[PDB]
């Protein structure tokens, strides 16, 4: 089953030099600090909070609408500060997501209506099924589904996730073409 068409009106999007397609309605905060590596899709009502720490995001990742990327807060012994958030290449974040993960690897897929606890670490090629909460300090190993409330390991992904996911994200970018201005 190929990725279906998903058209957008060209007026409320910004296409950048690197190829990032960031929606106008997305709430970018501290945009001087945010870094997108190109070919990124940030949909409407996305609250990317770069005003607290470095929020770097990899290539071809998709951040669906109404999703918040907020870097976590860590209380270390020497004092207090905000940990920078890092997201790898080819990450598919579904809508209505809440992300407080310290690190999200590459080839990751977060299900819709998901909340990720503070300072979580998501290794590469992991899935989180829909309507799932990951409490803080939860480490998802590669090739595992973390589902339920709380998210518990309840399966393993197929072998070819590194290939399937990079196909899916590329198809999503290639099929996210602007509406016909007729």
């Amino acid at each position: 089953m190929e990725l279906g068409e998903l058209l957008y009106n060209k007026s409320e999007y910004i296409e950048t030099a690197s190829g990032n397609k960031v929606s106008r309605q997305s709430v970018l905060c501290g945009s001087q600090n945010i870094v997108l590596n190109g070919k990124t899709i940030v949909m409407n009502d996305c609250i990317i909070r770069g005003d607290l720490a470095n929020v770097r995001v990899g290539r071809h990742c998709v951040v669906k609408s109404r999703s918040v990327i907020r870097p976590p807060f860590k209380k270390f012994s020497k004092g207090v500060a905000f940990f920078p958030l890092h997201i790898g290449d080819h990450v598919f974040i579904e809508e209505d997501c809440v992300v407080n993960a310290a690190q999200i690897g590459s080839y990751v897929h977060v299900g819709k209506n998901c909340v990720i606890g503070r300072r979580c670490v998501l290794k590469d090629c992991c899935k989180i099924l829909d309507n799932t909460v990951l409490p803080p300090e939860t480490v998802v190993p590669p090739f595992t589904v973390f589902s339920g409330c709380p998210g518990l390991f309840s399966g393993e992904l197929p072998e070819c996730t590194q290939e399937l996911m990079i196909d899916v994200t590329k198809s999503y970018y290639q099929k996210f073409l602007p509406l016909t201005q007729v």
Binding site: S18, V22, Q32
Partner: peptide, 15 residues
């Protein structure tokens, strides 16, 4: 690295 603010400014310049 090219910060997202720089890309937004370049897009504004293009318009």
């Amino acid at each position: 690295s090219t910060s997202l603010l720089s890309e937004i400014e370049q897009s504004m310049e293009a318009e």
